[PDB]
Amino acid sequence: GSSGSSGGQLDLLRSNTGLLYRIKDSQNAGKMKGSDNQEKLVYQIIEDAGNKGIWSRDVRYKSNLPLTEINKILKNLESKKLIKAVKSVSGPSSG
């Protein structure tokens, strides 16, 4: 009774994810300023990531907000000094 059957074929294409984001601390954060809900919905997704962090593309999908919005939100929390942005050194493997 062997399971076996693992994998088959893989055809990936060269693509880019973007930038990574993360929340700052887990206590000093709960005042906000600008967006109330539109922002609270973002900080929630970024916070859930913890150390793994969430890409601007991912947090955008779960947030269901357009770049025009996320662009302001991601920048909002930043100025508030509530979150911490993290830039990747090398997204793809083939360097």
Side-chain angles (χ1 to χ4, degrees):
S2 32
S3 300
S5 196
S6 277
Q9 197 196 57
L10 271 163
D11 198 282
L12 248 149
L13 208 85
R14 264 233 298 196
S15 88
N16 293 45
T17 316
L19 263 129
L20 195 56
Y21 270 85
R22 268 191 265 174
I23 57 156
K24 230 246 175 239
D25 257 301
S26 56
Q27 294 271 126
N28 268 123
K31 56 203 217 109
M32 310 220 112
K33 198 77 143 66
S35 263
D36 274 293
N37 293 17
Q38 237 75 74
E39 249 162 37
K40 265 210 195 149
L41 181 87
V42 186
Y43 190 93
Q44 276 288 274
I45 302 163
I46 302 174
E47 176 237 325
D48 164 59
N51 197 272
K52 310 228 105 170
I54 187 125
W55 303 82
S56 146
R57 187 139 199 288
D58 273 2
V59 58
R60 182 221 93 173
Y61 226 59
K62 295 201 112 171
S63 287
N64 210 335
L65 318 168
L67 49 114
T68 185
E69 290 282 51
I70 302 297
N71 278 356
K72 174 182 89 107
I73 303 171
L74 285 179
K75 243 129 153 61
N76 229 292
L77 277 161
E78 215 267 311
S79 226
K80 313 230 226 81
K81 201 168 291 237
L82 284 179
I83 61 177
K84 59 208 256 171
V86 285
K87 62 101 175 103
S88 73
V89 63
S90 43
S93 311
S94 296

